[PDB]
Symmetry: C4
Subunit: 190 residues, 4 copies
């Protein structure tokens, strides 16, 4: 439900940060690489969050931008990676580096990580390297921003990636509103 | 627990909208047709919400008015429809149209939707067409507002629809307070 | 976690009330008898809440005072009564009346309620009539306020009611702070 | 998710305290020893919280400082102790005393507590006495603050305590930022 927090840094205890928001102190778990970018206690901070429901707990994982959160979200969707390990992966390396490692396929580096499997490492690379394709953004892009947006949305709707791809690509060009595109796409399909 | 949000639109990423409320950024999932009616980022918005608890997540589905939320709630109560599909149904068509399709019984249209079943489509129509009856409102009405209110309440209480119907219809007429009606109805039954 | 709400009544739809608290609109389910006492929409209201976690939902049940909430809490602890029925019981009758019915043991009245069992009604009376004993308050009292408080606390701690009873009654008298009593009681027992 | 609350004490009903935060009244369960230190109703209070998710409830346990919370957290991680008993242990004795009892290994005292097991008491002592070692703080310390911090973090990451211990101890000395230490440690290990 919670995607972002805006408040004052009350305490820092890596990798935990306590952010006061209107009297409510929220504990946020952040990968060290994000952690380094946090402002000083007493100052205002903005963090992108990912909520994790768990058996005996409700947790928030935070990032400095939406790109890093996406990467995190992506990592955890795999069978072998959970939030805790995802946090460790992004504490040893930055989103950027991680992305490079995968592209350059360097398991070596990945293994140097606790709980990090080899067959796991290998599988990871393979898997992630694949997921980045359908991923657009500075991070995941070493075409059209709105089209790519309209697509994601259409895919969020239930349309098979390729279907969607086709559905917007048929009608299109700029000075459209992904919103407009999405809109159009739908009419022309139902 | 959360039925409405009032705050500033921070970002739009259809079908997701991020609404800032006193420093807390809430992610809201909205059907495209509602989405189109949202104000611009930076401005204040009011959205009616439906909370969905899930295995690994807590989600909020939002609408522009209570009527659309009801329709959504209604759709999801069926065996074949879940929140994600309900969101897709209301992204392809507006509450109004949807309501028409059902009344005019046009499966054709419904099928043109991913995950949307035929036997499902058929069953849907049949089912919804039935549920709208007991549903009062501009949407679900192509009698007395308070009586109909007193009834719903009495039905919320545990009374069988027909019982309730009868219970208020026996004593009644205007310049009553559904609250008054409900009140009266009860005394006269216990 | 949430025991009280202070905010503006945005809408009333018995038995549901929507209360705006700093931009967050909370849905509260209230027994009709409490409902009648609510102020007008647009005005400030204070409601005592009971949180109910459920399979696919998180709900808040509200009351006008702590006594009515207690009674509700009490009712639901029984095997045969759940929140929905407890809300119906307190919609047909007021906490006061309910309390009388039980004391005067009048099943007749109770049965006049949907889902309300006879063996259930009977069992209820019996059960509640018993629970009120250990219950102190205007409602549940057709001795010492602090002692009774110190006891409850000591009982919250794990002490068997009678033990606790004894533990404070040995040392005591006024111008004590239940807090003081509790304190004392403990030292003298460990 | 909630680690701290800052608001006005609305009511005290040991061991429960109701804290108003921006219109939201939060119920907090506090060990009596913490309870005694609370300010008067009407005044502002700051409490450190521990969230407990439960079958039919969501609860918050509060403390006056982070040390007492840690101790609580520690206690509950054991097989034999749950939140309710942990609250009773800290209501009979203060964090300090408790810590002493364990160090001085005095079961006698512990047993004087409801639900408190003997084999349990014994096991406890043994267990806690062990956990305090890896615990640094005034409470749990009848070396370097940042190093010890860097370690905890590295351990939060997945590193075996000893590994971490070694990893920071190799490179180190002051006027470092646990953050710096952590940082360094990582590079030199991957």
């Amino acid at each position: 439900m919670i995607g972002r927090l805006r408040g004052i840094i009350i305490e820092k205890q890596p990798p935990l940060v306590l952010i006061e928001v209107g009297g409510v102190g929220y504990e946020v778990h952040m990968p060290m690489t994000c952690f380094y970018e946090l402002p000083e206690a007493g100052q205002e901070a903005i963090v992108f969050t990912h909520f994790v429901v768990r058996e005996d707990a409700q947790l928030l994982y935070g990032f400095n931008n939406k790109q890093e959160r996406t990467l995190f979200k992506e990592l955890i969707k795999t069978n072998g990676v959970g939030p805790k390990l995802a946090l460790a992966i992004l504490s040893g390396m930055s989103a950027q580096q991680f992305v490079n490692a995968v592209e350059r396929e360097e398991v070596g580096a990945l293994v140097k990580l606790p709980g990090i499997g080899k067959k796991t490492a290998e599988r990871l690379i393979v898997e992630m390297k694949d997921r980045f394709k359908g991923l657009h953004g500075d991070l995941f892009t070493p075409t059209d921003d709105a089209e790519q947006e309209a697509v994601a949305r259409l895919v969020a709707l239930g349309y098979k990636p390729q279907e969607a791809s086709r559905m917007v690509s048929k009608i299109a060009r700029p000075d459209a509103s992904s919103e407009t595109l999405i809109r159009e796409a739908l009419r022309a399909a139902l």
